[PDB]
Amino acid sequence: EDTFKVGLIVPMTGGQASTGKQIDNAIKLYIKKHGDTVAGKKIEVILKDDAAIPDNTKRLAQELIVNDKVNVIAGFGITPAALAAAPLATQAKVPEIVMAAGTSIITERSPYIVRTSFTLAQSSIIIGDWAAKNGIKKVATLTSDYAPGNDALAFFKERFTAGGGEIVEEIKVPLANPDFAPFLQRMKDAKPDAMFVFVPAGQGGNFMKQFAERGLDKSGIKVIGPGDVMDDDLLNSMGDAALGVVTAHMYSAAHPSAMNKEFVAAYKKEFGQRPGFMAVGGYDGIHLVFEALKKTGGKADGDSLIAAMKGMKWESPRGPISIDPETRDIVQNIYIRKVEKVDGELYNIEFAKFDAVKDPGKT
Numbered sequence: 001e002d003t004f005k006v007g008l009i010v011p012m013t014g015g016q017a018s019t020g021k022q023i024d025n026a027i028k029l030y031i032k033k034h035g036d037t038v039a040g041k042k043i044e045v046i047l048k049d050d051a052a053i054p055d056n057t058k059r060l061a062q063e064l065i066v067n068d069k070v071n072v073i074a075g076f077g078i079t080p081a082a083l084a085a086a087p088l089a090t091q092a093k094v095p096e097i098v099m100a101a102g103t104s105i106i107t108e109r110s111p112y113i114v115r116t117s118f119t120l121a122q123s124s125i126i127i128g129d130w131a132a133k134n135g136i137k138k139v140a141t142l143t144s145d146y147a148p149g150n151d152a153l154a155f156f157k158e159r160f161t162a163g164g165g166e167i168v169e170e171i172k173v174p175l176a177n178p179d180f181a182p183f184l185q186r187m188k189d190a191k192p193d194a195m196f197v198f199v200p201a202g203q204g205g206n207f208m209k210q211f212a213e214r215g216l217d218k219s220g221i222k223v224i225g226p227g228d229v230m231d232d233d234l235l236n237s238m239g240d241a242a243l244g245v246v247t248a249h250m251y252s253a254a255h256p257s258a259m260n261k262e263f264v265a266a267y268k269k270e271f272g273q274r275p276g277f278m279a280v281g282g283y284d285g286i287h288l289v290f291e292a293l294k295k296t297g298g299k300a301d302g303d304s305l306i307a308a309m310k311g312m313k314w315e316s317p318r319g320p321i322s323i324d325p326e327t328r329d330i331v332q333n334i335y336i337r338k339v340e341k342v343d344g345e346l347y348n349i350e351f352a353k354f355d356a357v358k359d360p361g362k363t
């Protein structure tokens with residue numbers, strides 16, 4: 001009738017609290033900048049904290065759909081959370097907007113899922129190609145022991161070995177409270193040319209702290225990976241050991257576009273911190289909802305919304321992006337960046353751009 005509800009399910013507490021914080025903030029910023037009304041509907045955002053626990057995600061999604069009667073569910077800080085909600089999204093015909101989780105297969109788990117974040121494969125193929133072409137011969141991998149870490153590993157390995165690289169060791173660490181010290185100790189003794197590192201948003205600072213504590217910034221071992229470890233939400237808290245880390249990713253707070261300059265300044269002014277790649281996922285996720293509603297002339301049923309979302313394209317602070325009409329997954333530039341100091345702060349400075357990269361996990 002007059003209102004349209006978005007059930008926002010994100011980790012506000014626990015290990016992935018920094019992801020939920022950014023997504024909640026970015027959506028608040030979006031509404032502050034665009035208003036809360038579209039095609040005669042007042043948008044209400046209902047926040048629920050699942051603490052990145054899939055059992056909570058499922059119960060909260062049921063409550064939002066059945067009790068609160070939401071038109072869309074959104075967020076999903078980790079892959080298991082997105083997967084937990086998928087059956088309910090399908091049964092209730094409610095779009096599920098994935099603003100964080102990055103495992104390739106997620107969009108295949110419900111015809112109502114649409115993603116505005118990334119897949120690990122998008123970034124992992126690019127850094128794999130780059131490492132091989134740049135004389136890196138022997139690499140040890142460290143990856144979070146769950147779905148997106150496995151994607152990161154597989155796609156990096158594929159491209160890096162195809163280019164003549166060799167993986168010397170593969171090490172996996174738990175999602176919950178990882179201890180990086182053992183892998184890092186191994187590195188100090190084994191001295192590969194580089195370490196490829198995937199850890200989720202929120203953990204890169206801890207990784208870099210143990211890296212610097214074990215003295216590895218003086219070892220000549222390069223750090224490479226997808227951009228998650230060099231999370232812009234965390235870059236400000238890191239020391240000089242992070243200088244020179246090379247990552248591929250879809251977003252940098254240093255992206256030089258007019259829209260990004262405006263977004264970063266607005267976010268900093270409102271929240272007092274730099275947005276990271278999770279904030280952008282949220283910003284674009286809510287934009288997608290607004291634009292869909294506009295396109296349907298305010299029709300709020302799931303089928304109408306999904307139909308409008310497919311093939312949608314717009315400029316994001318990260319660059320031009322679109323929803324693939326075939327897969328419902330995000331198509332976006334992937335940049336390669338080097339951590340450099342500008343005006344006293346560390347930034348992921350983009351030096352390479354690959355245009356409109358479709359998820360390699362579905363191509």
Ligand SMILES: COc1cc(C(=O)[O-])ccc1O
Binds near residue numbers: 148201
């Ligand atoms: C919370 O941070 C992340 C989560 C995931 C996921 O679970 O699919 C992938 C990449 C990330 O940076």
